[PDB]
Amino acid sequence: EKIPCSQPPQIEHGTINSSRSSQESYAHGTKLSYTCEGGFRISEENETTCYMGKWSSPPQCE
Structure with a gap:
């Protein structure tokens, strides 16, 4: 039983896009990208x- 994920993590200065x-x-498998x-x-x-x-x-x- 795969579980859904919640809000993606955060990385100093940049955020998710x-x-x-x-x-x-979100669901299991989901692939989101990042932006600075x-x-x-x-x-x-x-x-x-x-x-x-x-x-x-x-x-x-960086």
Whole structure:
């Protein structure tokens, strides 16, 4: 029984780029991408995925 995930994690300076408030929870499998401020570089592959209602170690903005 896979569980849904809740609001994606947060990473200093940058945030998720889904469309802020659409839903509250997401389903298992979901793959959202990330975005940083206008002038920040993000580490390799700007994406986060969900596994059993938890997300994966999100990228960071440098």
